[PDB]
Amino acid sequence: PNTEFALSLLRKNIMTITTSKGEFTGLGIHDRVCVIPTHAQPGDDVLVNGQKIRVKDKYKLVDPENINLELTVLTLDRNEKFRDIRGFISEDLEGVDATLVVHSNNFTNTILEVGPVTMAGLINLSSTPTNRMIRYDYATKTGQCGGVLCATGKIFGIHVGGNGRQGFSAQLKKQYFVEK
């Protein structure tokens, strides 16, 4: 029933990004800047919705204690700029009924109602300690990495892992990006 924001994201900001590790959902933030899970390990080029695009720059986010945050910020060598969604990034997440918007592998155009979310903090994510993790009790799937955790007019984070009973997103913060 409440899909307008997710559909808007899918139409202007959410992509399928292919690396040598496979397909991931990716989120364009502003300009030519997008995010993908760090374990996607993007190379010098990626596929964006199937089209080969050179990676102008990339870097992995870590916190001030050098702990993995599991987000990699990519700058794409493409002319088109993303619709600016920096103003929707929200840390206002405790107890909100959130949605995952997925566009990769066998879950394209996919909207998941993951329920209330909370900050879990530090998690052992596939043997890498990872901070600023947001948790939901929902069954997630191998093909959904990169899914955008959001609510109406709010973007909370990016899905990066799970175990079939609980899923985890890397928190997105406005401070990760050029101020808008």
């Epitope: 879950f107 069954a139 799937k141 093909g143």
Partner: antibody
Framework: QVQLLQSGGGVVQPGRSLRLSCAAS????????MHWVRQAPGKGLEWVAV????????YYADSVKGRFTISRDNSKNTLYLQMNSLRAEDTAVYYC???????????????????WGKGTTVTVSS | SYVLTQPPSVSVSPGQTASITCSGD??????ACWYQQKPGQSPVLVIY???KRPSGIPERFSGSNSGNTATLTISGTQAMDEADYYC?????????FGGGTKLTVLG
């Protein structure tokens, strides 16, 4: 309050057409993909067809593709399955069902089915 | 054609745990849901998105999905649970029902 009221069906001669219909009430019909699912006598549930929330995407099981058409009227909260070129193997109870909002693909209409109609018996006299 | 397999029948006495499975290639990478169907009635959703219970569904029903197999467990089976149970898988390209399992509750 949430209701899928089905109508149509009966005995039909092979090669002919029959329209099944469903009137939806108690929810925002235009926001949901809808499926038809059928069950032959003493057999299991079999997916038949899907139409996406706005009617723009339609898919059919191999068993009925090229014969049946699915359609919807989001102003009259109605769903239709037009069964054409009927064959003996189409004999079944036909249910329509709403795709639940807990997790779904809004383009293909794939998902799980959280509300079912009572079912309409179609018997092909062949 | 993607095929989902279920055992034809399960039987338990009241209070026992009943376990009904459905299997298919990489089912654990798709979503599994479960429907209960009593004679002469429409299916009723009892588990969705692998493990979630709709409101009104008794807590004795639980679900899991991993590898190639989804499992519906009834912990403390009741006489009124006698029914056919159908698993259904979905992903973007998939809506498929398993063949069904007849659950008899006896003695």
């Amino acid at each position: 309050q949430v209701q899928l009221l089905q109508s149509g069906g009966g005995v039909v001669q092979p090669g002919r057409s029959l329209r099944l219909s469903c009137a939806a009430s108690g929810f925002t019909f235009s926001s949901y993909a809808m499926h038809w699912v059928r069950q032959a006598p003493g057999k299991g549930l079999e997916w038949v067809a899907v139409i996406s929330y706005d009617g723009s995407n339609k898919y059919y099981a191999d068993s009925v593709k090229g014969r049946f058409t699915i359609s919807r009227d989001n102003s009259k909260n109605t769903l239709y399955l037009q069964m054409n070129s009927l064959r003996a193997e189409d004999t079944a109870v036909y249910y329509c069902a709403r795709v639940g909002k807990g997790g779904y693909d809004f383009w293909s209409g794939s998902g799980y089915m959280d509300v079912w109609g009572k079912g309409t018996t179609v018997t092909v006299s062949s | 054609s993607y095929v989902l397999t279920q055992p034809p029948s399960v039987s338990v006495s009241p209070g026992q745990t009943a376990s009904i499975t459905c299997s298919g290639d990489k089912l654990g990478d798709k979503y599994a849901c479960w429907y209960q169907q009593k004679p002469g009635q429409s299916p009723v959703l009892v588990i969705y998105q692998d493990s979630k219970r709709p409101s009104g569904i008794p807590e004795r029903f639980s679900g899991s999905n991993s590898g190639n197999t989804a499992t519906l467990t009834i912990s403390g089976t009741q006489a009124m649970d006698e029914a056919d149970y159908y698993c259904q898988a979905w992903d973007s390209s998939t809506v498929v029902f398993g063949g069904g399992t007849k659950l008899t509750v006896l003695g």
